[PDB]
């Protein structure tokens, strides 16, 4: 009963276009394919804009005021968005491939590099109400005979430098009256001019060419004319300049060559501050901070994004995205981290809060098909088509074990015992389940009985029963543990593609090729419900398809499904452009999500394979925090979360309940009534007010008197609030009060409070323990130093 909204894209940090630093210098804006991602470097957080282009993005620019962000795709279609409120303002089509866009430092005007023409336009006023035609063109400039490589604004918003492929740099004047001030074309370079910049005084003009030559231009008597006073050459053996940026205040020149290495130079003395290589792929884009201390570099081939502190030679940010589509995903049991797998064969571990890759594992030779965590969460397991299963200890980030079959069986699915002592994998070629011992690494035995390739496996978290499904049109429940082992086969209408296990372990849901989600009772081995899927699925006709999409049977089934931890919903995905969220008890569609809107992707709308990228979701999973779910797709990991909560969803509301009345209970010191009434309104701002206004003395009294029905809500509110809140002692005092007062009730109903308790335990384990660990470490260091005898 929650609204999920796209929040951020993990798995890609840079794809193409130009990276731009926020004016304040604390945030970095990166185009990621069809969307733009913003990374908060100081706070170590990230988000991705919800607005979406028709095609991949080409260029981007943010105003110094930090209010207007313009994004233009490869077709020239522009989207103007408020940076502050993250909402689209206007759609404009420039009808031409714009190479670069840059706002004037005044912010009033913005210049477009459109082919061999420079277009300067007036910036819409954000404070004004929405206008239909806010874009008015100030001027169009037609001087270059070839496409413009890049453009640079003067610090005073009075002149613009543009470099074109005519081996020429030409300066204009923004004001018509000052046309005589700047109407000079600079020539002399033997290759394409990549950058033209002003000095801080703007007396000197620096121009750089692709060949690696830097010319310093000055206005002097031979009566006075611009001339090249000095010439500096980049003596790269074969590397060619691809991107250039210059900061006038500090006189820093950062140039990225095609060989994949960048050099930091001081102008005009041309001193090599530093030279580093990010790899063999070209350095696509380079940007400089306002202060000039952070340099952002990007390579499109491997999707690299690196922020460099050249002053201290430290790395603020260094991330690499998956080269391939992500085949599978797994959340850590607490949800603090998520692990992703790609067709390359490399696993990556990501922090949810930071949204950055903490480690990458490249032991697997071939594509990693599945990834799963143990119930403890310390260990992770993965299966790959190379024929191995590998166990990873995430506290020490080491592969402490590897499992393999006798004849190198290719594995596609993996499941692990909750006790973390048995691991089972399945294959498309053997029809048999291989079982290993985690402690020993030996093959215990192989579970036989399937006629078909095993498509999926899953252990019950509580009952530890193993459910296996196949293209055999059947499902088998294995009671492997115990003196005697039993198998209960249940036959199904069609080939099973996905299987999910209810957290209680009493039911099993499976997706079939017909497009049916059928739920079966494990103990009784009888069906309890069914959901239709064929109609709800959205599949777009492929450009190579000779058919109508309605007649197409390409993908009207879900290849992946998963329950909600609350257990009343299932998230399903497949080789299609739709994610459908179903309600199990009523068998209805809660909501459907469009995965992608990039017209480049095939499905959004004799020796050569006609092969192009397709929209598809490889795997889906609910966050254990019960606030988000992540879907692995070709672009990357799409995370939809319910954090915004702009919706008004009152519970047991009455006429007497009012935000003013809730405050009135507070000024009257009726804390319990205020807290209850706030929860009935279910307004977070009101709940936070009541929660922080309760004195510490009255917490135990309020805690003992909370009605049971509101108890699951308040425990959840504390857990998610506490994870980022600064009031640890206040929050812990609350949790102690609630736990001591209602501990028995929670034990009686573990499943009802399962998600709430887990969120609480995350806050106590991941931040609270870390604080005290430093505190107790400090205490013992003190006792050693003072008690101890001083050195001679």
């Amino acid at each position: 009963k929650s609204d999920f909204k796209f929040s951020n894209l993990l798995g890609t940090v840079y794809r193409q276009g130009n990276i731009t630093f926020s004016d304040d210098g604390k945030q970095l804006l990166s185009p990621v394919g069809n969307r733009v991602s913003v990374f908060d470097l100081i706070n170590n957080k990230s988000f991705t804009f919800e607005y979406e282009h028709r095609k991949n993005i080409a260029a981007i620019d943010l105003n110094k005021q930090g209010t207007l962000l313009i994004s233009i795709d490869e077709d020239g279609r522009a989207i103007l968005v408020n940076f502050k409120a993250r909402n689209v303002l206007h759609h404009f089509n420039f009808k031409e491939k714009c190479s670069a866009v840059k706002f004037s430092p005044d912010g009033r005007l913005f210049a477009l590099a459109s082919g061999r023409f420079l277009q300067i336009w007036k910036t819409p006023d954000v404070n004004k109400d929405r206008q239909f035609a806010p874009f008015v063109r100030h001027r169009v400039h037609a001087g270059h005979f070839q496409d413009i490589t890049s453009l640079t604004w003067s610090q005073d918003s009075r002149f613009i430098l543009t470099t074109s492929k005519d081996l020429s740099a030409k300066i204009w004047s923004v004001d018509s009256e000052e046309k005589n001030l700047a109407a000079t074309t600079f020539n002399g370079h033997r290759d394409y001019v990549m950058g033209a910049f002003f000095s801080h005084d703007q007396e000197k003009i620096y121009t750089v060419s692709k060949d690696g030559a830097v010319f310093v231009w000055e206005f002097t008597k031979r009566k006075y004319s611009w001339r090249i006073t000095k010439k500096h050459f980049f003596y790269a053996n074969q590397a060619k300049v691809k991107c250039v940026t210059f900061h006038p205040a500090t006189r820093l020149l950062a140039v990225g060559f095609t060989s994949g290495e960048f050099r930091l130079y001081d102008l005009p003395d041309f001193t090599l501050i530093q030279q580093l290589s990010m790899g063999q792929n070209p350095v696509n884009t380079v940007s400089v901070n306002q202060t000039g201390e952070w340099l952002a570099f990007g390579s499109s081939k491997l999707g690299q994004l690196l922020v460099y502190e050249w002053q201290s030679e430290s790395y603020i940010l260094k991330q690499q995205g998956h080269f391939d589509s992500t085949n599978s995903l797994a959340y850590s049991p607490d949800g603090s981290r998520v692990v992703t797998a790609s067709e390359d064969g490399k696993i990556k571990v990501w922090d949810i809060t930071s949204g950055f890759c903490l480690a990458t594992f490249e032991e697997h030779t071939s594509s990693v098909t599945a990834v799963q965590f143990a119930k403890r969460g310390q260990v992770m397991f993965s299966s790959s088509l190379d024929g191995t299963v590998r166990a990873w200890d995430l506290i020490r980030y080491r592969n402490f074990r590897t499992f393999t079959g006798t004849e190198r069986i290719q594995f596609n699915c993996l499941a692990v015992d909750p006790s973390g002592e048995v691991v089972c994998a399945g294959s498309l070629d053997n029809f048999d389940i291989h079982v290993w011992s985690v402690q020993t690494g030996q093959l215990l035995d192989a579970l036989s009985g399937h006629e078909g390739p095993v498509s999926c496996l899953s252990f019950s978290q509580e009952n530890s029963v193993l459910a296996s499904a196949s293209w055999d049109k059947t499902i088998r429940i294995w009671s492997i543990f115990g003196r005697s082992q039993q198998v209960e086969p249940i036959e199904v209408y069609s080939d099973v593609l996905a299987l999910s296990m209810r957290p209680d372990g009493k039911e099993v849901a499976v997706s079939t090729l017909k497009g049916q989600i059928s739920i079966f009772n494990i103990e009784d081995a009888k069906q309890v419900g069914n959901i239709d899927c064929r109609k709800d699925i959205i599949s777009g006709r492929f450009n190579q398809d000779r058919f109508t999409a309605k007649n197409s049977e390409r993908s009207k089934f879900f290849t992946t499904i998963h329950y909600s931890f609350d257990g009343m919903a299932i998230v399903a995905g497949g080789n299609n452009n739709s994610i459908c969220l179903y309600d199990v008890p009523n068998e209805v569609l809660l909501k459907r999500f469009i995965v992608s809107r990039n017209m480049a992707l095939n499905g959004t709308l004799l020796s050569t394979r006609k092969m192009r990228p397709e929209v598809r979701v490889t795997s889906v999973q609910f966050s254990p925090t019960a606030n988000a779910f992540a879907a692995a797709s070709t672009e990357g990991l799409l995370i939809y979360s319910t954090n915004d909560t702009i919706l008004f969803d009152p519970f047991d509301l009455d006429v007497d309940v009012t935000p003013h009345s809730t405050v009135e209970a507070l000024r009257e010191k009726q804390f319990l009534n205020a807290l209850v009434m706030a929860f009935r309104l279910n307004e977070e701002y009101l709940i936070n007010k009541v929660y922080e206004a309760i004195p510490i003395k009255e917490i135990p009294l309020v805690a003992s008197n909370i009605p049971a029905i509101y108890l699951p809500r308040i425990l959840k509110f504390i857990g998610d609030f506490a994870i980022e809140s600064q009031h640890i002692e206040f929050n812990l005092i609350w949790i102690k009060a609630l736990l001591s007062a209602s501990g028995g009730y929670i034990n009686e109903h573990k499943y009802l409070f399962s998600t709430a308790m887990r969120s609480i335990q995350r806050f106590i384990v991941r931040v609270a323990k870390e604080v005290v660990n430093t505190t107790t470490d400090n205490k013992y260091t003190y006792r050693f130093l003072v008690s101890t005898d001083g050195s001679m």
């Binding site: 003067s154 009075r158 001030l181 700047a182 002003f198 005084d201 703007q202 007396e203």
Partner: peptide, 10 residues
Amino acid sequence: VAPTALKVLL
């Protein structure tokens, strides 16, 4: 001025 102008031991 440019027309683009502003305004051994021991």
